[PDB]
Assembly symmetry: T
Homo-oligomer: 152 residues x 12
C-alpha cells in the first residue's frame, strides 16, 4: 500500500496547474463589490501557487523524478476539479470553489507530509509544511471573507 | 473567426505555451542550462503576462475567456508532447522557436483581422506582442546558429 | 473637427473627469470606501497623466491647449454636477463608468479621425488610452455586477 | 493633570488601542476582511509609532512611561472587551471609531493642556496625531455610511 | 467666515492654481523651458496634494468640498486667463508668484481664523502649506531676480 | 494543554515581552544606549511579528486568540514589573535574556507538543522562532560576557 | 524597403548620438547644466532607439550597419567637427534640425512600413516619432519658437 | 530682537555646532568609537539640514544669512575650542549635550519670539527642530547615564 | 556522526574548504561556460559562505566552539582539496563541484538524522533548508553536465 | 609635509563648503534652480572630500583642525560676507576661482605626497583633483569660457 | 604626442570600439549568444563611460575632443570591418580581445606619457581603465580557452 | 619577489585574515559584542572582496592564485591561533590591529615593488586597499584608546 514521494509531488504539479488556471478563472469572471480586492488577491494567489508549483517540480527533479509537463498530463492526473465558466457564478460561489480547492490541497499536502516523513525525505517534508502553512493562512482568510470559521 | 474568437484561441495557445516553457526549463540539460533556464523563467513571466493581457482584453470587448485546461487543449493550435524521450537543448529550443513562429504567424492573422474589424486596441496589443515574439525568434534562432527567417 | 480640436476637447474632458474622480473619492460612503478611494486616487493620476500627454501632444502638433477651468467647462462633453443630494456608491460608479464610456467612444472617434489625417502618433496615443479606458470599463462594470458592454 | 500625566495616560490608551486593532484584525469576518485587515495592519503600525513617540516625548520631558500591561490597564480610558460573542464588521468598526473619537477628544484636552503649560513640542506632536485621528474618523465613518461628526 | 468656508474656498483656489500651473508648463518658451517645466511638474503634484489634503480636512470637520469646475470658478479668488496672446517666461512666472502671494496671504487669514476657532489641526496644516508657499515665493522671486518680499 | 492553548499562551507571552522590550528601550541608560536601543527596536518588530504569526496560526487552526491586555496578563508566564527602581543595562539585559530563555523553553515544550499532535505547520513555525530566540540568547549572553547556556 | 530604411536609421542614430555628445561637450553658457543633463537623457534615449531599430532590423532578417564607416556612408544626419565656437542656440538649432530630419524620415518610414504590412516596425517608428515630436516641441520652446515654426 | 536676527544667529550657531560634531567624530576614542562615530555622522546631516532650513527660512522672510566663517564666529553663542589636550568620550559628549541644551534653550526663546511676531511658519520650524533636539538630549544624556533634565 | 556540536563543527570545516574550492573553480575555469559559471561560482560562494556562518552561529547558540582557523578546517574537513597544478576542463572542475555537493548532501542527511535523534529541532530545520539548496544545485549542475541528478 | 598639507585642506574645504552655501543662498537669476541644485551637489561632494581628508589625516597620525577659528587662521581659500549684490557670474567666478586654488594646491599636495612616498594620500588627492578639474570645465563652460582660460 | 593628443586618440578608439561591441552583439551566433550578448551590453556601457570620461578629462585639460564619426575614423588605431562574411563567435571574440589588447598597450603608453608629463589625474584614470581592460582580457581569453598573455 | 609572488602571498594572507575576522566575530564577548560583531561582518566582506580582487588581478597578469587552504597556510605571513583560552575583546582587537598593521606594511612593500616593475594597475589596487587598511588601523586603534601609529 504505497504511492511514493515522486508520485505525490508529480500529482501536485498536476493539481497546482489546474489550481493556477482556476485562480485565473476566478479573477477573470468575478463580479461584485469585491472585484478589486479579490482581483488583486487572485493575482497574489496566482504567483504564489505558480511559485509553489515550480518549487514542487524542481524538488521532484532534484529527487530524480520526471514532472508532468503538458496540460494533458495535468488533466489526467489532477484531483483538483475544473469546470468551464458557462453559468454566471457569485463571488461567494467562486470563493467557495477556491476554498474547497485550498482544503483539497491542504488535505493532500497533509498526506504528502506523512508520506514524506515515512520515506525520510526531510527536504520535501519541510517544503510541503511551508506550503501547508500558507494554504492554512489562505483558508482562514478566505473563510473569514465568506463569514465562516476556518474549519467550517 | 472574429476578434473574440481569435483572442480566446490565443488564451488557449499561451496557456499551452507557458507549460511548454516550463517543460523546457525543467528538462533541459547541457552547458546552456543556466543561461537558458533563466531565459525560460523570463519567457514564462512574459508569456504569462501576454496571456493575462489577451484574456483581459477579451473580457474588455465582451468576450468569455477559456478558463480551464480542457478548454485550452480543445482550442489550442500550439502542440504539446509529454517528455518521454530525452531531447537535446537544441531539439527543445527548435520546439520553442517553432511555437514562437506559430504564435508570430497567428498574431499576424490576428493583426489583419483586428485591423479589418476596427479593433484598434486589440490590434496594437497584438503588434506589441509580435514585436517581442520577433525579437525572441531572432535571439533563439541566433542561439541555434540560424538567421531569424531561416 | 481636426486632430488639434479633438485633442483640445479631450484636454477639457479629462479636466472635468479628473475633478469628477475627486468628487467620487471625497463623497463616497459605504463598505467599498477604502477599495474605491484608492482606485479613485489611481484613476486621478492616470487620467491626470493622460490629460498632460494629450496637452503635450497637442502642443507638439502646433496646437494651443485649453488651460483654464472656463475653457474646460466651455468645451467639455463630460458633464459634471455639484454634490447636493447624497449618492450611493453605485450611483457614483455608474456616473464614473458613464464618463469612461463617453471617453471611450470619443476616443474611438478621435482614433478614426487621427487615422484619416495620417497623424500616426496621436492615433497610437489614443489607442493606448482607449486600452486603459476599456480595461477600466470592464473592471468598474464587473464591480457593478455587469458585463463590460451591458 | 500635567503634560507628563497626560502623555502617560496616552501610552496606556495607545497600548490598549493597539491590541484592540489586533482584536479587530483577527476576528473580523465578511466581505471587507481583506480591505479592513490591511487597514488594521496600517493602524497598528501607525498607533504603535504614535505610542512610541508619546513615550519618547514623555521621556524627553523627564517623565517615566508606564511600561507594563498592568499599568496600561490601570490607567487607560480606552476600554477593551474579550471577544466572546461574534461581532459584525460594523460592530467592530463602531468600536474602532468610538475609540478614535475618545482619542481625538482626549488629544484635544491634551492639546489645550500642553498649550497652557507652554510645552510647544508636545503640543505639535498631539496636533499631528489628531490630524491623523480626524482623517481616520472621516474614513471609518464614511465606510460605515456616516458623516464624520455624526 | 468659518474654517469650513475657508478651506472650501481653498479647494476652489487650488484647483484654479493647479490648472494655471499646467498653463505655465504647457505654454512656456525660452531658455528656462526645461528647468521651469520640471519645476511646474513638481508644483502640480505638491499643490494637487495640498488641495487633496485641504478637501480631506474639510471632510474631516464635517464640511462638503466643492467638487465641480463650476463651483471652483464661482468661488476662487485665484484668477485665470485663457492663453491668447504670447506670454514671456517672465509674465507667466509673475502670474505664478502673484498667485502664490495670494495663496500665502489667504492662508495667513486662514491661520488667524483657525487659531480663533481653536481648530488646531487645520491651523498646523495651513502653516505647513504656507511654509512651502513662502519657500516657493523666495525661489521663484529669486529666479526673477527679485527679493522675496519686493 | 493542546496546540491551540499553547499558541494562545504565546500570544499572551509575546504581548508581555513586546511591552518589556519597550520598557528596556525606554529606560536604558549607559554607554550601550544607542547600540541596545536599536537592538530593542529590532526585537520589538521581530517579536511583534512572531506574535502576529502565532495569533494568525492560532486562527488558522480554529483557535481564538487572546486579544485584550487583561487576557494577556491573566495568561502569560512572562513576568513584568513596573520600572520603579533604576536598573543597570546589565539588569535590564538579564531580564531580557531570562525572558528569551523562558520563551525558548516554552517553545521547546510547544515543539514537542506540536510534534505529538501532528501539527507540522505549527511545529515548523515554533522551530523557526526558537532558531531566532537561540541566536539572540547567544548574542545577549555574549554581550553580558557569558556563554549562551551559562 | 523596411530593411533599408531601418538600416539608414541605424546610421542616422549613431551620427545623432555622437552629435548629442558634441553638443554636451562643447556647450557653453548659462544653460550648460540644464542642457548638459538633457543631452545625457537624449544620448540614452536615442542610443536605445538605435539598438531597438538594429534589433528590429535583425528580427526581420536584415543586417545592420555596424561600423562608423558604414554609418557615415549611409546617414542623412549631418555632422561637422567643432572648430568655430558655436552658441548654445546654434547647437540647439542643429539638434532641432536633426530631430526634424529624424521626424520626417520616420514619417516616410511609417508610410512605407504601413504599405509593406510590417505592423511591428510601424508601431516602433510611431513610438519613436512620439518622442521626437515631444523633443521638437521642448527644444523649440527652449529656443522661443512654436514646434512647427 | 526679531525673527530675522534670531534665525541668523542660529545659522551661526549651527555652523559652529556642525564643525564641533566633526571634532567629536574625528577625535573620539574608546569603546564607543563606532557607535558614536555613526551617531555624529547622523547629527552632522541633521543639523546641516537644520542649518540649511533655517537659512532658507531667513531668506524666505527677506533676511540675509551669515555666509562666512568670520560672520558665524562673530555671532555664534555656541562655543568652540581647538582640540589641544585629549578629551574623553564623556568630555566630548558633555560638550555635545551642553551645546544641544544651549540650542534647545535658544530655540525655546526663538519659539516665543516667533509666536509674538505671528511668524507661524518659523514657529513650527523651530518647534520641529526643538522636538529633535530634546530627543537627542534624552538619548545622549541616557548614554552618559543621566536623566534628560539632570 | 554523534554529537550535534561535532557535526556542525565538521561542517564549518567542510564549508570553508568548499568556499575556497568554489573560488578555485571560478578563478581557473576556462571555456565557453566561463561567464555563466563564473557568475554561478560567485553565487555559490555567497550562499555557502552564508551557510557556513549560519552553521557556526548555530554551533555558538548551542554552546559549541567553532573551528576558526584554516589549520582546524584542514585537520577536520572531509571535503577534499587539490592545488591547481594540471589544467582541468570545465567538466572536471564541475564534477569535483558536484562530487563535493553530493558529499555535503550525504553528510547533511547524516546530520539531519542525528539532529532529529538528539531533539535539536532548530539545527534539524537549518540542515534541511541547506540540503534543499544543495539538492537544487546537484540537479542544476548535473543537468549542466548532461546527467540526471541521481546519476 | 603631508600632515600639514592635509590639515590646510581641512581648513580650505570648510571655508569652501560655507562659500558653496553662500552662493546657493544668495544666488539670483534664471539659473537659480539649476545652480542651486548644483551647489547642493558641490556641498555634499566637498563635505565628503573634507571628511575624507580629515580621516586620512587621522589615519597618518595627524590632528585635524576642528574649529572655525582654526579653519579661518589656516585656510588660503578666501571668504567675504555678502554685502553688495553679486551676479550669478560673479558668484560662479568666485566658485571657479576657489576650485582653481584647490586644484593648484592639490597639485602641490600630489607632488609632495609622491616625494614623501605617501601613496594613499597621493591617490586620494588625485581622485579629488579629477573631480575639481571636471567642475572647473563645467563651471567655466557655464561662464562661456574654455577650462584653462 | 602629448596628453591632449593621447586622450583624443582614445576618444576616437573608444567610439570605434563601442560600435565594434555592437557589431559583435548583433551578429553573434551560436550557443554563447545570450551569455556573450549580455556581456557585449555590459562592455558597451563600460566603454561608452570610459569614452565619455576620457573626453571629459580632455575637456578638463583644455583639449578639444573629436566629436564626429569622420574624426574618429581619421584618428583611431582600432580597426573596423563591415560585417560581410559570416564570422564564428571565436573570430568575433578574437577581434574583441585583439582590440582590448591594443587598448591595453596604448593605455600603457598613455600611462607612461602621462606620468612623464606630471598629469597625475589622467594617469590614474588610464590606470583604472587598464585595470578593467586587463580583467576583460583575462576573462575573454579564458572564454577562448587561453591564458591572458597567450 | 615579483608582483605575481607578492599578490599570491596576499591571496594567502587575506584568506587567513578573513577566517581570523570570523574568529573574532564568533568568540567576542563583552559590551562591544554588537558594535564589533557588525564591524567584523563588514571587514569580512571587504577583505573577502580585496582577496577576490587580488586573485583576479593575479589572474589578469598571468599568475596562478593559491586556491587551497593548504597553500594559504603554507604561504601566509598572517598568523592564526585556534581559540582555546578565553581572550578579551582587547586581546582580539590587538590581534586584528596587529594583522592590519602587517597587511599595511606588506602592501607598502607591494606598492614599492609594483612601482619598480611598472605594474601601474596592481600599484593603484594596492594603494586603494592600503587606504582602507590605514583607515581601519586608525578606527580600531581609536577604539582601543590609542593613536594610529602608537
Amino acid at each position: 500500500n504505497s504511492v511514493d514521494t515522486k508520485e505525490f509531488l508529480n500529482h501536485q504539479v498536476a493539481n497546482l496547474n489546474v489550481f493556477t488556471v482556476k485562480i485565473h478563472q476566478i479573477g477573470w469572471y468575478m463580479r461584485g463589490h469585491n472585484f478589486f480586492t479579490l482581483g488583486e488577491k487572485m493575482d497574489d494567489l496566482y504567483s504564489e501557487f505558480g511559485e509553489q508549483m515550480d518549487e514542487v517540480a524542481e524538488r521532484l527533479l532534484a529527487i530524480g523524478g520526471s514532472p508532468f509537463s503538458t496540460l494533458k498530463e495535468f488533466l489526467e492526473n489532477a484531483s483538483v476539479e475544473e469546470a468551464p465558466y458557462t453559468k454566471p457564478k457569485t463571488m461567494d460561489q467562486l470563493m467557495e470553489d477556491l476554498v474547497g480547492t485550498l482544503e483539497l490541497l491542504r488535505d493532500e499536502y497533509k498526506q504528502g507530509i506523512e508520506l514524506t516523513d515515512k520515506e525520510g525525505d526531510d527536504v520535501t517534508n519541510d517544503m510541503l509544511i511551508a506550503f501547508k502553512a500558507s494554504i492554512d493562512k489562505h483558508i482562514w482568510m478566505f473563510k473569514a471573507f465568506l463569514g465562516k470559521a476556518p474549519l467550517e
